[PDB]
Amino acid sequence: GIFNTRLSRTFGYTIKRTTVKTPSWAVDMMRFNINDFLPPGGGSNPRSVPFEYYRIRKVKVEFWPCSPITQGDRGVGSSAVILDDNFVTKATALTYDPYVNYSSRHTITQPFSYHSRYFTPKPVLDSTIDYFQPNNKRNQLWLRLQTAGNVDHVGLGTAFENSIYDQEYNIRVTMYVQFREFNLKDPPL
Amino acid sequence: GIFNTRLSRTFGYTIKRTTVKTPSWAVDMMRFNINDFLPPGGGSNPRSVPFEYYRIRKVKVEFWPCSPITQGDRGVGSSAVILDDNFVTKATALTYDPYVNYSSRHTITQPFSYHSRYFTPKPVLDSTIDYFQPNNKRNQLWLRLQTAGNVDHVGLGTAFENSIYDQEYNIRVTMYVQFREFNLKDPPL
Amino acid sequence: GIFNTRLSRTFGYTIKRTTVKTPSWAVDMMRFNINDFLPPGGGSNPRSVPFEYYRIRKVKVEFWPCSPITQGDRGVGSSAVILDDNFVTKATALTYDPYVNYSSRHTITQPFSYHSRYFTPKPVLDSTIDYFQPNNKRNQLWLRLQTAGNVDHVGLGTAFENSIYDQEYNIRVTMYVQFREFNLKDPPL
Amino acid sequence: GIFNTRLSRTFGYTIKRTTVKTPSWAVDMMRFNINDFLPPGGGSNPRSVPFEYYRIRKVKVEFWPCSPITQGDRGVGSSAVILDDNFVTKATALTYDPYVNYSSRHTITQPFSYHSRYFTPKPVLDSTIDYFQPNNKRNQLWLRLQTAGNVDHVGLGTAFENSIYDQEYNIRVTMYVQFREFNLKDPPL
Amino acid sequence: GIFNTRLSRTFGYTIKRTTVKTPSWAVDMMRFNINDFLPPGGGSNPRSVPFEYYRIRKVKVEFWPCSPITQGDRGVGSSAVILDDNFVTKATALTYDPYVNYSSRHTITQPFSYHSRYFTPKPVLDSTIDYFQPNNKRNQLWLRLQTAGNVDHVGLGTAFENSIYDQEYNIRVTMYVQFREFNLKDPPL
Amino acid sequence: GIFNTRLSRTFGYTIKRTTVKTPSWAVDMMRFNINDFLPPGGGSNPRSVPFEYYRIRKVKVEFWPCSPITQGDRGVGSSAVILDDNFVTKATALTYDPYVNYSSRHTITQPFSYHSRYFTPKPVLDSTIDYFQPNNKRNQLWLRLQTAGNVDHVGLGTAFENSIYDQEYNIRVTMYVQFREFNLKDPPL
Ligand SMILES: O=C(O)[C@@H]1O[C@@H](O[C@H]2[C@H](O)[C@@H](NS(=O)(=O)O)[C@@H](O[C@H]3[C@H](O)[C@@H](OS(=O)(=O)O)[C@H](O[C@H]4[C@H](O)[C@@H](NS(=O)(=O)O)[C@@H](O)O[C@@H]4COS(=O)(=O)O)O[C@H]3C(=O)O)O[C@@H]2COS(=O)(=O)O)[C@H](OS(=O)(=O)O)[C@@H](O)[C@@H]1O
């Protein structure tokens, strides 16, 4: 019983100002979990979408700027796809862009420019070995939609060039999911 | 955002015994409401299936017998489709089968025989005028999935021939519904 | 060195009687392990079928009744396919059939009727995440035929309607397996 | 339930040295039994390959030398196929090669040369009459895989020319067999 | 960013002499890890090949002999492919060749003969269950190129026939690997 | 062993204000060396990218503005390709644009506008004679990847109109190179 749908979530991210003169970059990570998109249900149905299995097909991360088009001290960054839960260490002012030479690098124009990334994440099945599957719609694993313990999906790391002014963003993540085995429970009343 | 699914519900019906010698029939009615198939949800989602609109496409009423194949004093009844909320009055021992000459009559062999009816019900929009639409999948009205006040659908009346022995049935109603406008609400936690 | 064969096993299951008047259902689970079908071998060959690897292709669960065709208080249940080791909790008299709205539900006529289910199980690789593969004969994983520690395969849950009389069954599970790498060891004597 | 497989076995054979000056030959025989290739099983399965019937299709006898390529006093012998259990009498130093004029003679170069023979043996059904079947894959008799009393198959006799030095060989016999009627027994535990 | 290349490594293996008269075999195992082929890098690049992911496509194990062609007491062994990290126990003088009846057995002529094996190994993801994938270039898992903790690949076991003389070999393993996501880091200086 | 790839780097360039009233321009050159893009390796491998050879195909210079779009006192400049390491003399405020009439001139809008150039640089073999090859992908030379002594490549010089305000740019370079002769070294540990 397949049901492809779309789930979204919005949150903020700010790159604080720095008095540093050099071009330094701010590094951070981004994971994706389905608990943040799918709330708990009620009653005999533990989740709000009554299905048993799921598998995330795609994610769309949108960096919607919060800064005016008149803001100066512009910069240039990079967003890369990291499917293994080993990101570059979080840094405030690093002397280089680590994600620049990555094959999945897209340039981030800053601060007043929109940046989208559309890709297929991978689940963290074993963080010790960090193995994942290649892209195959027919062979992608089905995970279970747990009650409160779903596994973290992974796949984006960023590097933003710091500035004299604060750079704020409203980040909207949209997960395109595919469920299976409609499992609604209908007790009496 | 269409989602065709199937919702079921099971309950009992008994035709009590009678010392009456004549062939008399027991008349009863059967309505269908979605509150009995779809429970209330939890939180910002008032219902367990997160959709706004619905329209019932078909219903399958199954009379599953509870009586052995050795039971005697067998009989013959009738099930008809009544799409207007004006049934023959409920009777314990009526001297005739009212639903026998109906164009939608199917014979009910009793007591140990299975009887199915598969039809398209109609909602009770105005009980004073009792108007309904003909069968058209493209023009069928969309109703709202209310929180606790959904409208009764209608469409089956029965007439069972009484017997010296009690005739029990387990009735399983299955509604084939079609929802629209996925309306999940995801507050923070 | 492929060798497709068929292994069987027979055991009993009883649904005890209840004085409860309502229609209640008895819920139970069913797992499949190869130790119960393949005994230990002898000598340098740890198992009786001299192969290294295996993968279960299909299972046929047959509920052969033990009750006469004259037994009354008949009922109606459901059998569903549960490929993840999270079954509905075992219950003696539950007020509803949980497996009724499942997409893999087959109706169980009770008590004197035969019920078969033919499906492809999945192994329990990680019970925490509960991931499994879709059906693909070419990409199905090969497991190792361990000596005394094989992994449990999963895939059936049932719900039987209780009765005044005891409902007994002789359950015959047949696993259709596929082995690989003939590994017979022939020491002298 | 046919299963064609391959069973092997390795053992030694030595032609001891002789001070005799003349060219003399050492004669010996070679039978084939399935007990030497198939060990006893364990439990309710008396044999390690769980089948009832068998029939030997082919045998490959390989004389793998043990002697260096610098060894002198080389010689020339003969291997023939003897399907009736009446071999030339075993001799240490016979004044001629008895198997030389046989229609199934292959020359054995000695001592450091490989010799293979690939043929279809015959079972010893009656040693008094010594009757056997011609080669026909469709009409070949099925024998029973006994527990500890299988019948000897026959089909090779050799004649090695003696030498001043010892001539050792590692003989690897490979039987290509065909079983029938998978008969595994699975008691409880 | 794919880059198919070839990495090699050379090491020794000796089968010590034995006074035992019988034909006995020496059993040993062979695993493959990428730390032994890829050294650690320097600086911000933890490895010498600047890539993130890898997957081993093929391995070529070459037994280059160290013994002269005049060496006697020759023998015959077997090399088999074992993709699950459960080898036959290491033995000095075992009374039989365990890897002889394996479907992946290749004969090892000893001592002065070259033996190659070209196959696709499998990683040890779970040693408890020992599951692996079949051969599929498009669906083969990508592993991470760790810093100092890469996972062991597996796939060869051997059985050498012992001798009066020591049998030495220089074993050259060549792994054909496929990397992904060029991740060079270029800080200033 | 060919390997095409991409390397990049980022640095700043500013044009200090001038109280001069006339239209004056500021001149500066730009060289290209691989040591700035490719850090040193570690251990036996002197460089992080294990190859012997390289030859630059293309370079992509990117003038990313740091200024707002509201800035006044706009101007206009020029850039040109210079393949000999004999540029126009560096100047602060020159009364004309030297690089205007060059055939390889691309106009530069200032101060808030993007500017890019995509060309083939050339090496400096002999600064005295200043010779090179026409563009040819097949006949281009292969240079050696030295340890700390690689040669400077060349190919860009600029001219920026001065202003009352400071014009700051973030310059990103991108090189498209092509290596050869994979030269990895695997000592033991
Ligand atoms: O006759 C004249 O016009 C004289 O002009 C002035 O001499 C100045 C130079 O003009 C000035 N350079 S400017 O850019 O033209 O202003 C400055 O040169 C030094 C700078 O570090 C570099 O100059 S630049 O022109 O390349 O920018 C340059 O560094 C070179 C180095 O010279 C190279 N070796 S050499 O063989 O050429 O000597 C090589 O080592 O690479 C270096 C780095 O180059 S890179 O491009 O950065 O990679 O040369 C430097 C140098 O030679 O000193 O200084 C010159 C000397 O004057 S001062 O610095 O002592 O003041 C003078 O007048 S004024 O204009 O300064 O007032 C005067 O000598 C004449 O009028």
Side-chain angles (χ1 to χ4, degrees):
Chain A
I2 309 306
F3 174 57
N4 297 274
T5 191
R6 178 191 67 191
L7 307 168
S8 301
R9 180 217 170 194
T10 296
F11 66 97
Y13 174 61
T14 190
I15 308 99
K16 285 249 171 286
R17 56 178 169 265
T18 48
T19 46
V20 172
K21 296 287 187 179
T22 30
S24 63
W25 285 258
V27 191
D28 206 335
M29 24 269 208
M30 187 180 289
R31 282 154 245 254
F32 315 112
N33 197 315
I34 190 129
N35 303 326
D36 296 318
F37 298 81
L38 204 67
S44 300
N45 291 278
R47 283 279 159 186
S48 49
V49 167
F51 287 86
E52 277 202 273
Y53 318 129
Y54 83 99
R55 64 183 175 180
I56 292 162
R57 291 284 207 191
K58 292 282 175 178
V59 178
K60 189 177 165 90
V61 196
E62 301 173 301
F63 297 82
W64 294 97
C66 275
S67 302
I69 64 180
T70 72
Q71 214 211 79
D73 199 342
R74 295 148 74 187
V76 69
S78 295
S79 52
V81 172
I82 307 301
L83 309 170
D84 277 68
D85 206 65
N86 298 139
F87 295 95
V88 184
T89 325
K90 181 171 180 189
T92 298
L94 187 68
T95 59
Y96 59 107
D97 187 5
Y99 296 110
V100 70
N101 286 327
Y102 277 56
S103 291
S104 63
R105 172 259 283 171
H106 284 203
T107 319
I108 313 183
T109 311
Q110 299 167 229
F112 54 79
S113 296
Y114 169 84
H115 185 59
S116 64
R117 295 293 320 247
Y118 183 76
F119 62 99
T120 303
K122 307 292 174 190
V124 178
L125 278 14
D126 192 64
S127 51
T128 299
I129 294 158
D130 284 310
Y131 61 91
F132 66 96
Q133 274 193 315
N135 285 12
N136 207 292
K137 288 188 178 292
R138 197 185 289 282
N139 302 115
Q140 191 180 20
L141 303 165
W142 297 96
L143 322 170
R144 173 124 217 148
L145 191 57
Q146 306 298 149
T147 303
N150 274 286
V151 75
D152 290 314
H153 289 52
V154 80
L156 202 75
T158 71
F160 285 82
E161 192 169 8
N162 282 310
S163 167
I164 296 156
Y165 317 105
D166 294 346
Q167 301 176 100
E168 298 188 22
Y169 292 87
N170 301 303
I171 296 158
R172 168 168 289 185
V173 193
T174 310
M175 294 209 310
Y176 296 84
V177 282
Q178 179 174 58
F179 302 94
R180 197 189 169 183
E181 205 73 2
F182 189 79
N183 63 343
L184 193 80
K185 304 204 161 51
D186 175 71
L189 34 61
Chain B
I2 309 306
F3 174 58
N4 297 274
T5 191
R6 178 191 67 191
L7 307 168
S8 301
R9 180 217 170 194
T10 296
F11 66 97
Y13 174 61
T14 190
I15 308 99
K16 285 249 171 286
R17 56 178 169 265
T18 48
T19 46
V20 172
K21 296 286 187 179
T22 30
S24 63
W25 285 258
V27 191
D28 206 335
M29 24 269 208
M30 187 180 289
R31 282 154 245 254
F32 315 112
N33 197 315
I34 190 129
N35 303 326
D36 295 318
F37 298 81
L38 204 67
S44 300
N45 291 278
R47 283 279 159 186
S48 49
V49 167
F51 287 86
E52 277 202 273
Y53 318 129
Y54 83 99
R55 64 184 175 180
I56 292 162
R57 291 284 207 191
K58 291 282 175 178
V59 178
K60 189 177 165 90
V61 196
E62 301 173 301
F63 297 82
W64 294 98
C66 275
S67 302
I69 64 180
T70 72
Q71 214 211 79
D73 199 342
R74 295 148 75 187
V76 69
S78 295
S79 52
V81 172
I82 307 301
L83 309 170
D84 277 69
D85 206 64
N86 298 139
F87 295 95
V88 184
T89 325
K90 181 171 180 189
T92 298
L94 187 68
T95 59
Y96 59 107
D97 187 4
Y99 296 110
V100 70
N101 286 327
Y102 277 56
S103 291
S104 63
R105 172 259 283 171
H106 284 203
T107 319
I108 313 183
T109 311
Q110 299 167 230
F112 54 78
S113 296
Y114 169 84
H115 185 59
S116 64
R117 295 293 320 247
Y118 183 76
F119 62 99
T120 303
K122 307 292 174 190
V124 178
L125 278 14
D126 192 64
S127 51
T128 299
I129 294 158
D130 284 310
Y131 61 91
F132 66 96
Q133 274 193 315
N135 285 12
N136 207 292
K137 288 188 178 292
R138 197 185 289 282
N139 302 115
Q140 191 180 20
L141 303 165
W142 297 96
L143 322 170
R144 174 124 217 148
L145 191 57
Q146 306 298 149
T147 303
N150 274 286
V151 75
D152 290 314
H153 289 52
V154 80
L156 202 75
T158 71
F160 285 82
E161 192 169 8
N162 282 310
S163 167
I164 297 156
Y165 317 105
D166 293 346
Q167 301 176 100
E168 298 187 22
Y169 292 87
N170 301 303
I171 296 159
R172 168 168 289 185
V173 193
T174 310
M175 294 209 310
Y176 296 84
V177 282
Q178 179 174 58
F179 302 94
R180 197 189 169 183
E181 205 73 1
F182 189 79
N183 63 343
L184 193 80
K185 304 204 161 51
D186 175 71
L189 34 61
Chain C
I2 309 306
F3 174 57
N4 297 274
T5 191
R6 178 191 67 191
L7 307 168
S8 301
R9 180 217 170 194
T10 296
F11 66 97
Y13 174 61
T14 190
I15 308 99
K16 285 249 171 286
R17 56 178 169 265
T18 48
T19 46
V20 172
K21 296 286 187 179
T22 30
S24 63
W25 285 258
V27 191
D28 206 335
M29 24 269 208
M30 187 180 289
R31 282 154 245 254
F32 315 112
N33 197 315
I34 191 129
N35 303 326
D36 296 318
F37 298 81
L38 204 67
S44 300
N45 291 278
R47 283 279 159 186
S48 49
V49 167
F51 287 86
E52 277 202 273
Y53 318 129
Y54 83 99
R55 64 183 175 180
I56 292 162
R57 291 284 207 191
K58 292 282 175 178
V59 178
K60 189 177 165 90
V61 196
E62 301 173 301
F63 297 82
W64 294 98
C66 275
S67 302
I69 64 180
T70 72
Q71 214 211 79
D73 199 342
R74 295 148 74 187
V76 69
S78 295
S79 52
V81 172
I82 307 301
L83 309 170
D84 277 69
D85 206 64
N86 298 139
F87 295 95
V88 184
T89 325
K90 181 171 180 189
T92 298
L94 187 68
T95 59
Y96 59 107
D97 187 4
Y99 296 110
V100 70
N101 286 327
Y102 277 56
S103 291
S104 63
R105 172 259 283 171
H106 284 203
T107 319
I108 313 183
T109 311
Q110 299 167 230
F112 54 79
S113 296
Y114 169 84
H115 185 59
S116 64
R117 295 294 320 247
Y118 183 76
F119 62 99
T120 303
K122 307 292 174 190
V124 178
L125 278 14
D126 192 64
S127 51
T128 299
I129 294 158
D130 284 310
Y131 61 92
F132 66 97
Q133 274 193 315
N135 285 12
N136 207 292
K137 288 188 178 292
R138 197 185 289 282
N139 301 115
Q140 191 180 20
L141 303 165
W142 297 96
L143 322 170
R144 174 124 217 148
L145 191 57
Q146 306 299 149
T147 303
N150 274 286
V151 75
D152 290 314
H153 289 52
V154 80
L156 202 75
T158 71
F160 285 82
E161 192 169 8
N162 282 310
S163 167
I164 297 156
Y165 317 105
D166 293 346
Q167 301 176 100
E168 298 188 22
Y169 293 87
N170 301 303
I171 296 158
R172 168 168 289 185
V173 193
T174 310
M175 294 209 310
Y176 296 84
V177 282
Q178 179 174 58
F179 302 94
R180 197 189 169 183
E181 205 73 1
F182 189 79
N183 63 343
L184 193 80
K185 304 204 161 51
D186 175 71
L189 34 61
Chain D
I2 309 306
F3 174 57
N4 297 274
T5 191
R6 178 191 67 191
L7 307 168
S8 301
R9 180 217 170 194
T10 296
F11 66 97
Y13 174 61
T14 190
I15 308 99
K16 285 249 171 286
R17 56 178 169 265
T18 48
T19 46
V20 172
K21 296 287 187 179
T22 30
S24 63
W25 285 258
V27 191
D28 206 335
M29 24 269 207
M30 187 180 289
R31 282 154 245 254
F32 315 112
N33 197 315
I34 190 129
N35 303 326
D36 296 318
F37 298 81
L38 204 67
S44 300
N45 291 278
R47 283 279 159 186
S48 49
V49 167
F51 287 86
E52 277 202 273
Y53 318 129
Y54 83 99
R55 64 184 175 180
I56 292 162
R57 291 284 207 191
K58 291 282 175 178
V59 178
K60 189 177 165 90
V61 196
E62 301 173 301
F63 297 82
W64 294 97
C66 275
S67 302
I69 64 180
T70 72
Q71 214 211 79
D73 199 342
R74 295 148 74 187
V76 69
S78 295
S79 52
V81 172
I82 307 301
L83 309 170
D84 277 68
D85 206 65
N86 298 139
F87 295 95
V88 184
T89 325
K90 181 171 180 189
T92 298
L94 187 68
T95 59
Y96 59 107
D97 187 5
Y99 296 110
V100 70
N101 286 327
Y102 277 56
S103 291
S104 63
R105 172 259 283 171
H106 284 203
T107 319
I108 313 183
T109 311
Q110 299 167 230
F112 54 79
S113 296
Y114 169 84
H115 185 59
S116 64
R117 295 293 320 247
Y118 183 76
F119 62 99
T120 303
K122 307 292 174 190
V124 178
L125 278 14
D126 192 64
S127 51
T128 299
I129 294 158
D130 284 310
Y131 61 91
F132 66 96
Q133 274 193 315
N135 285 12
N136 207 292
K137 288 188 178 292
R138 196 185 289 282
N139 301 115
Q140 192 180 20
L141 303 165
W142 297 96
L143 322 170
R144 174 124 217 148
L145 191 57
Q146 306 298 149
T147 303
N150 274 286
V151 75
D152 290 314
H153 289 52
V154 80
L156 202 75
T158 71
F160 285 82
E161 192 169 8
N162 282 310
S163 167
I164 297 156
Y165 317 105
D166 293 346
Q167 301 176 100
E168 298 187 22
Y169 292 87
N170 301 303
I171 296 159
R172 168 168 289 185
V173 193
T174 310
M175 294 209 310
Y176 296 84
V177 282
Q178 179 174 58
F179 302 93
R180 197 189 170 183
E181 205 73 2
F182 189 79
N183 63 343
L184 193 80
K185 304 204 161 51
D186 175 71
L189 34 61
Chain E
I2 309 306
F3 174 57
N4 297 274
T5 191
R6 178 191 67 191
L7 307 168
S8 301
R9 180 217 170 194
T10 296
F11 66 97
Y13 174 61
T14 190
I15 308 99
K16 285 249 171 286
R17 56 178 169 265
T18 48
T19 46
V20 172
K21 296 287 187 179
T22 30
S24 63
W25 285 258
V27 191
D28 206 335
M29 24 269 208
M30 187 180 289
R31 282 154 245 254
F32 315 112
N33 197 315
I34 190 129
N35 303 326
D36 296 318
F37 298 81
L38 204 67
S44 300
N45 291 278
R47 283 279 159 186
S48 49
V49 167
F51 287 86
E52 277 202 273
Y53 318 129
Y54 83 99
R55 64 183 175 180
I56 292 162
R57 291 284 207 191
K58 291 282 175 178
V59 178
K60 189 177 165 90
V61 196
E62 301 173 301
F63 297 82
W64 294 97
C66 275
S67 302
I69 64 180
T70 72
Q71 214 211 79
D73 199 342
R74 295 148 75 187
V76 69
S78 295
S79 52
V81 172
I82 307 301
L83 309 170
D84 276 69
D85 206 64
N86 298 139
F87 295 95
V88 184
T89 325
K90 181 171 180 189
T92 298
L94 187 68
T95 59
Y96 59 107
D97 187 4
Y99 296 110
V100 70
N101 286 327
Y102 277 56
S103 291
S104 63
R105 172 259 283 171
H106 284 203
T107 319
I108 313 183
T109 312
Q110 299 167 230
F112 54 79
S113 296
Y114 169 84
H115 185 59
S116 64
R117 295 293 320 247
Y118 183 76
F119 62 99
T120 303
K122 307 292 174 190
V124 178
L125 278 14
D126 192 64
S127 51
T128 299
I129 294 158
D130 284 311
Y131 61 91
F132 66 97
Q133 274 193 315
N135 285 12
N136 207 292
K137 288 188 178 292
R138 197 185 289 282
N139 301 115
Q140 191 180 20
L141 303 165
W142 297 96
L143 322 170
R144 174 124 217 148
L145 191 57
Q146 306 298 149
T147 303
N150 274 286
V151 75
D152 290 314
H153 289 52
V154 80
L156 202 75
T158 71
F160 285 82
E161 192 169 8
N162 282 310
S163 167
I164 297 156
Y165 317 105
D166 294 346
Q167 301 176 100
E168 298 187 22
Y169 292 87
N170 301 303
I171 296 159
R172 168 168 289 185
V173 193
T174 310
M175 294 209 310
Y176 295 84
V177 282
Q178 179 174 58
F179 302 93
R180 197 189 169 183
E181 205 73 2
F182 189 79
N183 63 343
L184 193 80
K185 304 204 161 51
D186 175 71
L189 34 61
Chain F
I2 301 299
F3 182 69
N4 289 318
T5 185
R6 129 163 106 190
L7 296 173
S8 296
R9 183 177 181 270
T10 304
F11 64 94
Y13 171 62
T14 184
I15 299 93
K16 299 293 183 182
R17 63 185 186 275
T18 60
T19 60
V20 177
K21 299 292 184 182
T22 61
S24 66
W25 292 266
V27 177
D28 191 358
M29 70 294 287
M30 186 179 288
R31 280 76 177 271
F32 306 99
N33 190 359
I34 190 163
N35 291 318
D36 293 330
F37 294 85
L38 181 62
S44 296
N45 296 313
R47 297 291 189 184
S48 66
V49 174
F51 293 99
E52 289 185 352
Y53 298 103
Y54 64 93
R55 63 183 178 178
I56 299 161
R57 297 292 186 185
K58 299 291 184 181
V59 176
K60 183 175 174 68
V61 177
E62 295 180 354
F63 293 99
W64 293 98
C66 298
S67 293
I69 60 170
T70 61
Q71 184 178 359
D73 194 358
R74 296 162 66 188
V76 65
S78 296
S79 57
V81 176
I82 302 295
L83 296 171
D84 293 325
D85 197 74
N86 295 114
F87 293 92
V88 177
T89 303
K90 199 163 106 243
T92 303
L94 183 62
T95 61
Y96 63 93
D97 188 0
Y99 294 98
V100 67
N101 289 318
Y102 292 171
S103 296
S104 65
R105 190 259 300 161
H106 290 173
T107 304
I108 296 167
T109 304
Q110 293 182 355
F112 62 91
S113 296
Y114 182 75
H115 182 73
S116 66
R117 298 294 299 273
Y118 182 76
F119 64 93
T120 304
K122 299 290 180 181
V124 177
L125 281 73
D126 184 74
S127 66
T128 302
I129 296 166
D130 298 323
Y131 63 92
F132 63 91
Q133 294 179 355
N135 290 319
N136 189 1
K137 292 183 184 292
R138 187 179 294 276
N139 297 117
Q140 186 176 1
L141 296 172
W142 292 98
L143 295 173
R144 178 59 176 273
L145 183 62
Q146 296 295 112
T147 305
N150 290 317
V151 66
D152 293 331
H153 294 83
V154 66
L156 184 63
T158 60
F160 285 77
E161 185 172 2
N162 290 315
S163 178
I164 297 166
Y165 315 100
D166 293 330
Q167 295 178 353
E168 293 180 353
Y169 294 88
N170 287 318
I171 296 168
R172 181 177 282 186
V173 177
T174 302
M175 294 178 71
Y176 293 97
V177 298
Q178 181 170 355
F179 294 96
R180 183 178 178 179
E181 188 64 24
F182 182 75
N183 61 1
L184 183 62
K185 295 180 175 66
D186 178 75
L189 58 88

